[PDB]
Write a protein that binds this DNA or RNA. Structure first.
Ligand SMILES: [Mg+2]
Ligand SMILES: [Mg+2]
Ligand SMILES: [Mg+2]
Ligand SMILES: [Mg+2]
Ligand SMILES: [Mg+2]
Ligand SMILES: [Mg+2]
Ligand SMILES: [Mg+2]
Ligand SMILES: [Mg+2]
Ligand SMILES: [Mg+2]
Lengths: 144, 314, 190, 225, 142, 81, 101
RNA sequence: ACGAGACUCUGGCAUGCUAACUAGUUACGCGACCCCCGAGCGGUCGGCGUCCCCCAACUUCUUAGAGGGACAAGUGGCGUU
RNA sequence: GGGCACCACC
């Protein structure tokens, strides 16, 4: 009876993992987090000031599900639609300097490591942490 | 003085029932081939609601299934189809154990030997092929077997020299000698194409029929024409009673029983009550088989049904 | 087992009081489904849409205008919320409310036009039951749509109010007014 | 390096098209019919189909020895990989290109349009074709242009069988007062072999065989042999 | 304990879902995730319909794992339903009697025929002169 | 519409005239005989011809047809008349 | 003994399949081990153009299409036998490439 | 007789055939993680072997060849039947 | 006076 990541709801898992990363306090946060927007198709900066932890949690979860993703892959993952005035909308990618710093910060926690083929993947410690978080989420969901 | 009464009906098919096979080893099971590309194994309950229910469906044929025959021990089954291939199935698991390839047209008839070591098959390719169990065509016959399609091929279950009898759409009944595979006898008496040929359990008499509607009885060991019995429109199936010395012919709307000693009709089997449906043609009787017990006839019809007739003695 | 719409609204207690419309409203046992979403081919043949469940017909007719074409998940959610609101407001089965609203909203006598492009003259005719159901659904959806526009009020609340008023027979609803005016003009064109 | 398969096939097609155009312009006078390129890793062979090979060969083979030179100069592949051959067409009456050239040169010599067109039509029909059509368009008589049409036999227009049952040729001839246009269509006969016609029949032609004589049976006879 | 299993597929416009059904205890998963975690959850009942119609008793002896690919979200859900139903029917046909298969097939077909028979509809090609297959560009006079 | 062009009707009538003995009321046996005797370069055309042959055979069994006449039918009508 | 791959590229399928069958039969007559022929996905080149040489009339378009078919055959054998069987294989319209991996 | 139809390409069906490390599935080994209250013939894995000395089978899913399949054929009405 | 067509209407 062991809970894995795929068993629980993904949004609640992301919330719980972001809370765990914030409470840990060992994550490295850039200085410009409060003055930048996450992509060129965004109009405003993110509403949540603790958005870096949420993005790090999402990146860790994605590396859990599909390993070997680089900066370009993460940039494509978080890209979205761009509306440009009186012209038709088009797909647009995210900011590379945010994805790169999220990956570097996760590597600083010994949760993400360089992949032999290329890109980054999860360490056994990161997988253990994610499975523990999934178990906590499942227990909280069942108890209430 | 026996009356044949309809006992029940088996409904599992979606197409014309084409052949019915029985076996002495297992009286409680029947095997029926049909035009829905499926061979149904029927388990007989003899209950109130249903005389029998389907047990397993053998489905590996892409086209219609024409003929089906069980082995001596009732453990394997053989089948020919319109896709040009023969299939050998294990009845225990219902899985195809062997496939016979080599015919370029529809395989109309297939027959097992008396020892289950030789297999014969006639095709619309005007070709008769002889195979072994492993699936290798040991001998094909292009020696002027027939100028037209080969309808039925059967073995002779007699202690004497093994014989294979075939009927053609060229109005001919040919008799070939086994283990040498040479033409031994020709029979030219019919006016029209032939459908079925059968052999008596003694191995002495054979019956042939077709569109002309006359069942002609020939002598196998001597090689002469013996008798001719008039019947209905088209003779689809001919069978011999294993223990009663009878000849049962399957005509379109009805089934006729002849006593070979008296040449007198014993019974005619047909039923339809609805007056509105009289305009439409009654379903034809395609296939015919005797249970080894000798008391039940199984008749397969165009109506996608299998009807059982029970003998009542008086 | 028992099949309840959205898992909580049963169909056994619902009954249709109009003999004419019994054959064209599909709410009963063999038409009981869990969701108003089946991806069926009901437009392939004539009269086949009488076999489509009436909740799914409302859902199909709620995907207007062109800015809402094809968005059927949002429409299913809207119908679900509207049924919840109807149950809270009235206290009865929202399927019965929908059936009553459709029965009351369908015009019974119409007027057919013979018009030279400017001037038009008309003659009173009867309406088949299928057209009654179609026009009732169209009127209800149009009323809810016009109520929700440029107003701080959810589309589900407006749909619930329209359905409740139509089932009650009140003239506060768009469909009742439209039916009354159509029947008045038909009466005057006899 | 190497190029992709798409580019390779398009390049082969373009080379064949340019070779055909050059050979047409060079050998129109000799009844040039077609060109067939067979590519072998040893040498690339080119077969020239024309009505008469004597003019293509020239005296002592000079002219053909010239052509295989310029081709090598044009497309640039190395010497010794080029070899041209001349083969006469099996039946010249069933080729629309050769008939169009023949009509063009008859008109160029000053013959009457009607006489030459009827002669070409008669030759095509005598060769064994199902049918033929010849259209000549231009300033045949006067300042106003018109079109003359000569048809004979059968002819199909629509469908897929037009692709392999009809042979078409369009040509231009420059006369003193301007250009005339020539169109020739020939409908090939059905041939079980692929020599002078399509192998497959027309889709809607059904040939029902005559049944053979059968002896009426009278008495059951058993024959043993 | 013989190794008895069946793999059956189901299709929607471009979506294909293949279900592997073997002897087991009652596990049913899609891409490794439970049935209740598949999105969108608006159409969750469409995914639970075969289980609700047949009950957990008939699924209590098999493990089913589905792999989905292609199409959109709704098409993938409708493919998963059909794959589950057809896989259960094919398993009952081979490793149980024909009567149970007949009962299950009748129950499934009465509720919805698309649980066992695929929908042939596919997108129609665009023709030049208009935005799509049927629509044409706006014509003008004078 | 499902009207048959004169090609199918002519081919079916000629087949019934020449091979009345070999035909019957079964579409599949008829379509197997047609490819045996006739040369149809299309599968759809052969199916159409066989499907009209079956309809014509049923009509003949019901009674005389305005068009083709079978030698056996003529000889039988001689005995009838 | 080499692992040798034969790649066949053609524009029509009848000639390509005839050549593939000839190669398979020839190789198997020498009691050799053959894998394939494995058929790659067909390639479809498309060119859509306007019919009119000018810009007048209804806007009508021609859709020209070219299809390329590709086959693979694997053989465990020495070079000499492969060339023996390949020499016959020369066919008009089929490009045959022999490589040693 | 031409045109229309027929014809060619295309989209739907095949657990039947042919055969694939430039497509996969399943199974079996190795490994990572979770549950020591059920630790297991347990769950997740787009993590690594299984063709190339020897270390698995098979085409359901993917590709593309050969064939099948539908004809207003079956039933009931309406039609000059 | 009839027949047809969402480049006609309903
Ligand atoms: Mg995105
Ligand atoms: Mg904008
Ligand atoms: Mg509002
Ligand atoms: Mg034509
Ligand atoms: Mg046409
Ligand atoms: Mg589209
Ligand atoms: Mg569109
Ligand atoms: Mg396959
Ligand atoms: Mg309008």
């Amino acid at each position: 009876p062991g809970v894995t990541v795929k068993d629980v709801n993904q949004q609640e898992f992301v919330r719980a993992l972001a809370a765990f990363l914030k409470k840990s306090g060992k994550l490295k946060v850039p200085e410009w987090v409060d003055t930048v927007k996450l992509a060129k198709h965004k109009e405003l900066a993110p509403y949540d000031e603790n958005w870096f932890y949420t993005r790090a949690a999402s990146t860790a979860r994605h590396l859990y599900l599909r390993g070997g993703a680089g900066v370009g892959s993460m940039t494509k993952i978080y890209g979205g639609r761009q509306r440009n005035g009186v012209m038709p909308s088009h797909f647009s990618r995210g900011s590379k300097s945010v994805a790169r710093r999220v990956l570097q910060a996760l590597e600083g926690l010994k949760m993400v490591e360089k992949d032999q083929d290329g890109g980054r993947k999860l360490t056994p410690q990161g997988q253990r942490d994610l499975d523990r978080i999934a178990g906590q989420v499942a227990a909280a969901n069942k108890k209430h | 003085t026996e009356q044949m009464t309809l006992r029940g009906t088996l409904k599992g098919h979606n197409g014309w029932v084409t052949q019915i096979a029985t076996t002495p080893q297992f009286p409680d099971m029947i095997l029926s081939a049909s035009r829905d590309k499926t061979i149904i194994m029927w388990k007989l309950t003899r209950d109130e609601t249903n005389y029998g229910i389907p047990q397993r469906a053998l489905r590996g044929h892409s086209h219609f299934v024409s003929d089906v025959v069980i082995s001596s021990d009732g453990q394997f089954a053989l089948s020919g189809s319109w896709d040009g291939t023969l299939r050998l199935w294990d009845l225990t698991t219902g899985t195809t154990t062997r496939r016979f390839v080599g015919h370029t047209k529809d395989v109309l008839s297939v027959a097992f030997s008396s020892d289950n070591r030789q297999i014969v098959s006639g095709s619309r390719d005007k070709t008769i092929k002889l195979w072994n169990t492993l699936g290798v065509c040991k001998y094909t016959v292009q020696d002027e077997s027939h100028s037209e399609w080969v309808s039925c091929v059967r073995f002779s279950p007699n202690s004497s020299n093994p014989i294979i009898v075939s009927c053609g759409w060229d109005k001919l009944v040919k008799v070939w000698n086994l283990a040498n595979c040479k033409l031994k006898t020709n029979h030219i008496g019919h006016t029209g194409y032939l459908n079925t040929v059968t052999v008596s359990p003694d191995g002495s008499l054979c019956a042939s029929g077709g569109k002309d509607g006359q069942a002609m009885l020939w002598d196998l060991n001597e090689g002469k024409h013996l008798y001719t019995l008039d019947g209905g429109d088209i003779i689809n199936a001919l069978c011999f009673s294993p223990n009663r010395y009878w000849l049962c012919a399957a005509t379109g709307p009805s089934i006729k029983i002849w006593d070979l000693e008296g040449k007198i009709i014993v019974d005619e089997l047909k039923q339809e009550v609805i007056s509105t449906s009289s305009k439409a043609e009654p379903p034809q009787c395609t296939s015919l088989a005797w249970s080894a017990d000798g008391q039940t006839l199984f008749a397969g019809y165009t109506d996608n049904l299998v009807r059982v007739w029970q003998v009542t003695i008086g | 087992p028992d099949i309840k719409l959205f898992g909580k609204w049963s169909t056994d207690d619902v009954q249709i009081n109009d003999i004419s419309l019994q054959d064209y409203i599909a709410v009963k046992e063999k038409y009981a489904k869990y969701l108003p979403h089946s991806a069926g081919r009901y437009a392939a043949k004539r009269f086949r849409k009488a076999q489509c469940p009436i909740v799914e017909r409302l859902t199909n007719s709620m995907m207007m205008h062109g800015r809402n074409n094809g968005k059927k998940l949002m429409t299913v959610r809207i119908v679900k919320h509207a049924f919840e609101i109807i149950h809270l407001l009235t206290g009865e089965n929202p399927l019965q409310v929908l059936v009553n609203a459709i029965i009351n909203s369908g015009p019974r006598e119409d007027s057919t036009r013979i018009g030279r492009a400017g001037t038009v003259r008309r003659q009173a005719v009867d309406v088949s039951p299928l057209r009654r159901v179609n026009q009732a659904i169209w009127l209800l959806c149009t009323g809810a749509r016009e109520a929700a526009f440029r107003n701080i009020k959810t589309i589900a609340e407006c749909l619930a109010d329209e359905l409740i008023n139509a089932a009650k027979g009140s003239s506060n609803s768009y469909a009742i007014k439209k039916k009354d005016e159509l029947e008045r003009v038909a009466k005057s064109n006899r | 390096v190497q190029i992709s398969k798409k580019r390779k096939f398009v390049a082969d097609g373009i080379f064949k098209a340019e070779l055909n155009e050059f050979l047409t312009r060079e050998l129109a006078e000799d009844g040039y019919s077609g060109v067939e390129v067979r590519v072998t890793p040893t040498r690339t062979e080119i077969i020239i189909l024309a009505t008469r090979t004597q003019n293509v060969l020239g005296e002592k083979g000079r002219r053909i020895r010239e052509l295989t030179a310029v081709v090598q100069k044009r497309f640039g592949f190395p010497e010794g990989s080029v070899e041209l051959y001349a083969e006469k067409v099996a039946t010249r009456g069933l080729c629309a290109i050769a008939q169009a050239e023949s009509l063009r040169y008859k008109l160029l010599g000053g013959l009457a349009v009607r006489r030459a067109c009827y002669g070409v039509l008669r030759f095509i029909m005598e060769s064994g074709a199902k049918g033929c059509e010849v259209v000549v368009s231009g300033k045949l008589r006067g300042q106003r242009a018109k079109s003359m049409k000569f048809v004979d036999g059968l002819m199909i227009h629509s469908g897929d069988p037009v692709n392999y049952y009809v042979d078409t040729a369009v040509r231009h001839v420059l006369l003193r007062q301007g250009v005339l246009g020539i169109k020739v269509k020939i409908m090939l006969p059905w041939d079980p072999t692929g020599k002078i016609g399509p192998k497959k029949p027309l889709p809607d032609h059904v040939s029902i065989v005559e049944p053979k004589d059968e002896i009426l049976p009278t008495t059951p006879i058993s024959e043993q042999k | 304990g013989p190794l008895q299993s069946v793999q059956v597929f189901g299709r929607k416009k471009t979506a294909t879902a293949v279900a592997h059904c073997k002897r087991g205890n009652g596990l049913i998963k899609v891409n490794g995730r439970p049935l209740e975690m598949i999105e969108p959850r608006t159409l969750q009942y469409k995914l639970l319909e075969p289980v609700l119609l047949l009950g957990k008793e008939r699924f209590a002896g098999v493990d089913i794992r589905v792999r989905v690919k292609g199409g959109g979200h709704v098409a993938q859900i409708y493919a998963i339903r059909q794959s589950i139903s057809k896989a259960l029917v094919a398993y009952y046909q081979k490793y149980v009697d024909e009567a149970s298969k007949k009962e299950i097939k009748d129950i499934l077909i009465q509720y919805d025929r698309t649980l066992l028979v695929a929908d042939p509809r596919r997108c129609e090609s665009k023709k030049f002169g208009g935005p799509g297959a049927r629509a044409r560009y706006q014509k003008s006079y004078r | 519409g499902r009207v048959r062009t004169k090609t199918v009707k002519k081919a079916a009538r000629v087949i019934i005239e020449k091979y009345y003995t070999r035909l019957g009321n079964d579409f599949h046996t008829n379509k197997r005989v047609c490819e045996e005797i006739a040369i149809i370069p299309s599968k759809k055309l052969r199916n159409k011809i066989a499907g009209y042959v079956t309809h014509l055979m049923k009509r003949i069994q019901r009674g005389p047809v305005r068009g083709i006449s079978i030698k056996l039918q003529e000889e039988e009508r001689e005995r009838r008349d | 003994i080499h692992r040798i791959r034969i790649t066949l590229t053609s524009r029509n399928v009848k000639s390509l399949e005839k050549v593939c069958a000839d190669l398979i039969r020839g190789a198997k007559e020498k009691n050799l081990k053959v894998k394939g022929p494995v058929r790659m996905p067909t390639k479809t080149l498309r060119i859509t153009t306007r019919k009119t040489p000018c810009g007048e009339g209804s806007k009508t378009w021609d859709r020209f299409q070219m299809r390329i078919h590709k086959r693979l055959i694997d053989l465990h054998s020495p070079s000499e036998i492969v060339k023996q069987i390949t020499s016959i294989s020369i066919e008009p319209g089929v490009e045959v490439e022999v490589t040693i991996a």
